[PDB]
Design a protein around this ligand. Structure first.
Ligand SMILES: O=C(COc1ccccc1P(=O)(O)O)Nc1ccccc1C(F)(F)F
Ligand SMILES: O=C(COc1ccccc1P(=O)(O)O)Nc1ccccc1C(F)(F)F
Ligand SMILES: [Cl-]
Ligand SMILES: [Cl-]
Ligand SMILES: [Cl-]
Ligand SMILES: [Cl-]
Ligand SMILES: [Cl-]
Ligand SMILES: [Cl-]
Ligand SMILES: [Mg+2]
Ligand SMILES: [Mg+2]
Ligand SMILES: [Mg+2]
Ligand SMILES: [Mg+2]
Lengths: 229, 229
């Protein structure tokens, strides 16, 4: 439905929707902006990520509540029906995001900051699909997440400093993938610890403001290391 | 869309949606339950009110953010367009609730607790329509709210004790109508003070649990009196 609205107007309205905490509207505005076909700036990529992370975050929290109730019941079919409703809507949001990345955000992303950002997003949305998947459809979804994260890591290590916040956040989320999805707690701890230590050694190169940006994410790595060790 | 689902299943799913904080789904489930045509029990009326109050509360908060931004701008048409979008969706939610009350909740409500509950709801949803109305369409909406609240007050004073929580909450919201909508701060303060004092004198009749229920709402009356005097 956003075909008739100006790209600039879509971006302006996404920012208004963020201020209003209207994240479903924010995501529809930013989907419309992506579908204009032009590449996104750094600000715009962040608007797209904030919108969908808040939409899928609501869905994941609801799915977890319903799944817990369903497991405790294991009356009639209603808890399973409603958990399946919420699950299908969550899957649809992830498939929307993955579709924007495949048509055609990733293929036109040539700079490291854009290409790593999009491949991290592809890892994250396959990861949310894996959280609700079962069996051996689940295996192929987990491998799709792994592959996207790994391509993003390879580029980030070649092209960005170890304190770059997108590099840091990629490594944080890939560590969470290993601990929560891939049953690989030692890989998770290794990655979080190596990433924290390599960033610490590069902090001296940063301005006050960059230092604030990087140490924020480093603290998240440390918080996880504390939960996991 | 809820015509094929059992009434009991709709109520069960509304309670699951409340636990999941999925208030739009909760409201659609309870609209479906109302549209079965049977009267609602006390528990069910509370589920219907909780669902819509959370849906319209999100819309009112967003509308206030957008309206404030629009007033500060007074660029191009986008802030007005998006405030109008949110306003129209808010109006639609209120028109849905008012339609359920008119078809046919109020006309079949013969007991005081049900009839006062529904007429309070009719007052509240016309009040939310008045918050976004302008001019002299606004006057007729304000009079619709007034009339519903007044019918509810007349029945509550004849039929319920002064500590009854629905009577208390009606009086609290009618006081807010007078202060925020009708430009009648003295009527608001008079009503809140008379309602608080009449409840205080009846507390001695209550059990521990009823006393907790009533004094909760009395504290809201006192909190408003503090803001207004
Ligand atoms: O509690 C968490 C913490 O998750 C992470 C921690 C570190 C890095 C990435 C993530 P990710 O799994 O990408 O969010 N997430 C969550 C789970 C369910 C619902 C809503 C949310 C949210 F709102 F995001 F918090
Ligand atoms: O801040 C308030 C306090 O309003 C009242 C106080 C006393 C009696 C009735 C109300 P009412 O005006 O019926 O809610 N409401 C509000 C306003 C905007 C958005 C969301 C909300 C909500 F979530 F309800 F808090
Ligand atoms: Cl369902
Ligand atoms: Cl390219
Ligand atoms: Cl620990
Ligand atoms: Cl709009
Ligand atoms: Cl009747
Ligand atoms: Cl005061
Ligand atoms: Mg154009
Ligand atoms: Mg390019
Ligand atoms: Mg039946
Ligand atoms: Mg009846």
């Amino acid at each position: 439905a956003m075909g008739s609205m100006e790209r600039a107007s879509l971006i302006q309205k996404a920012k208004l929707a963020e201020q209003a905490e209207r994240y479903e509207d924010m995501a529809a505005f930013m989907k419309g902006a992506v579908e204009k076909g032009e590449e996104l700036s750094c600000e715009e990529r962040n608007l797209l990520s904030v919108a969908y992370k808040n939409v899928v975050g609501g869905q994941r929290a609801a799915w977890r509540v319903l799944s817990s109730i369903e497991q405790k019941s294991n009356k009639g079919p209603e808890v399973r029906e409603y958990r399946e409703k919420v699950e299908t809507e969550l899957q649809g949001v992830c498939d929307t995001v993955l579709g924007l990345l495949d048509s055609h955000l990733i293929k036109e992303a040539g700079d490291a900051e854009s290409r790593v950002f999009y491949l991290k997003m592809k890892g994250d949305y396959y990861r949310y699909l894996a959280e609700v998947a079962t069996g051996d459809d689940k295996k192929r979804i987990i491998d799709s997440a792994r592959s996207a994260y790994q391509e993003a890591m390879d580029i980030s290590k070649k092209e960005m400093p170890p304190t770059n916040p997108i590099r840091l956040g990629l490594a944080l989320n890939f560590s969470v993938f290993h601990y929560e999805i891939a049953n690989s707690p030692e890989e998770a701890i290794s990655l979080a610890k190596t990433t924290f230590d390599e960033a610490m050694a590069d902090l001296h190169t940063l301005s006050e403001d960059s230092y604030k940006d990087s140490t924020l994410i480093m603290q998240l790595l440390r918080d996880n290391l504390t939960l996991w060790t």
